C-alpha cells in the first residue's frame, strides 16, 4: 500500500453500523409540514433529507412510517420543507414533541405559518426558505419511509438569497449532529 | 391569519423551483468511492445524501447517471461513503476534476485509500469516518439516480467519535451550501 496507507493501518476502528448516521453528519435540519383530511396542520423536524434531482426539481426525506408526516402525505400527497434558521433552533426542537394528531405543533412552538402557492400545507412564517412539494413516491426502506417529492413552488424570505445560494451567513441554517447537538452553518469557506 | 402570518404576507418572494437544492442547505460533503470490473478505483465528492434506515442501516446518495460512480455501482454494487474533514477540503474539490475513467482521483488529489472490510472499493485514509455500502437499488429519478445501500461496515478515525456522535468539534466536517460555497460545520450548539 502507499507509506500513508501503511502507517494508518492501525488508526481506524469498527464502528457500529446501525450508527452509520451518525457519522453521516452534520445534516441540515427541515420543519416539514403537511395536513391531514381535515385540513389539520402538522409539522415536524427532519435531518434525514437530501435533493434527488435539480430539473425537474425532486426532493426527499426519510421519517418513520408510523409519523403524522408520514401518514398525512399517505393521505394528502402533498408537504412544504421549511429550512430552519438558527434564530427559531429552540422553537422548531419543540415540534418534535409528541403532539396529538390533528393539533398544529407549530402553535405549541410559537411559530407562525401563512398559505403556500401551489399546495395546501402551510409555510412556516420564520423558516427563509420553502419547498412546496407534491408526492412522488413513498418507498418503504428499512425502519424509515423514503419520500421524494416534486417541488412545484418554492419561495424565500427577503434577503435569505446570496448570489442565487442560500445566505448562511445571514441565514444560519441549522444543522443536526444527533441528539440535542447541532450545528450552525454559517461558516463560509471558498475553495478557490 | 396570525398577526405574525399578516405582517410578512408580503416579506416573501417566489424562488425558483429548479434551484430548490440551493435552499436545501449546507449538506453533508462525502467522497464516494467505488471501482469497475477491473478493480480500478474512483472517487468523487456527494453533496446529495441522507440516511435513510437506522436499523437495517440504509444510506442513500443521487448521483448524474453518467459518473463513473453511477456506472461503477451499477456493475459492482458497491461503494464507500467517506466524510469529508475540513483539513482535506481542497483536495476532496480536485477528486471533483473530470479525471478518465479507471483512474484513481485520489492519486491526483494527493489522498491515500486502504482496504476496506467487507467491500471492494477502499477507505479513503485522511477521512475520519466510512460506510462500507451493498447497493440497494438504483432508483432513477429527474436528471439523478436515487443511490440507497446498506451499510454492511461502518469505521471511524480514533478521536473522530464524541459520545457516539461524529465529532464535529475535532472532525470540522465539510458541508456545501453550493457552488465552490462551504460550510465548516464545528459549531456545537446543544439545545436544551
Ligand atoms: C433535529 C431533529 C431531526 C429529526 N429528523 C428525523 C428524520 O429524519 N426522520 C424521522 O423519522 N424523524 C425525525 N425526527 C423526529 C420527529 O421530528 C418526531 O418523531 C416528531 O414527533 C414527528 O412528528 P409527526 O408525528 O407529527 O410527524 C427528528 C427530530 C429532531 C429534533
Ligand atoms: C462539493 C461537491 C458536491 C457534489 N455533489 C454531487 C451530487 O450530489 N451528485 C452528483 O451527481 N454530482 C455531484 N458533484 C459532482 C461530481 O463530484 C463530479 O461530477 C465528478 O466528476 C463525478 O466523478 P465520477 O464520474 O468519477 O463519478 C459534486 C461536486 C462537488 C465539488
Ligand atoms: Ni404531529
Ligand atoms: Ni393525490
Ligand atoms: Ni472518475
Ligand atoms: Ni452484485
Redesign the interface.
Known sequence: ??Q??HM??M??????????????????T?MVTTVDEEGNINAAPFS???????????????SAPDHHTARNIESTHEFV?N?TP?DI??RM?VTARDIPAGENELEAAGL????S?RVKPP?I?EAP???ECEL?RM?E????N?I?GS????????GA?KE???D?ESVK?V?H????????????????
Open positions: 500500500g502507499s500513508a496507507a494508518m493501518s488508526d481506524f476502528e469498527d464502528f457500529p453500523v446501525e450508527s452509520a448516521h451518525r457519522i453521516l453528519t452534520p445534516r441540515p427541515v434525514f433529507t437530501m435533493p434527488v434531482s435539480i430539473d425537474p426539481p425532486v426532493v426527499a426525506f426519510a420543507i429550512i438558527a433552533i429552540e426542537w407562525a405559518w401563512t398559505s402557492r409555510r412564517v426558505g420553502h419547498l412522488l418507498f426502506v428499512g425502519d424509515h423514503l421524494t417541488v412545484v413552488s418554492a419561495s424565500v424570505r427577503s438569497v442565487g445560494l442560500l448562511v441554517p444543522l449532529v444527533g441528539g440535542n447537538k447541532f450545528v450552525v452553518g454559517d461558516h463560509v469557506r471558498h475553495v478557490e
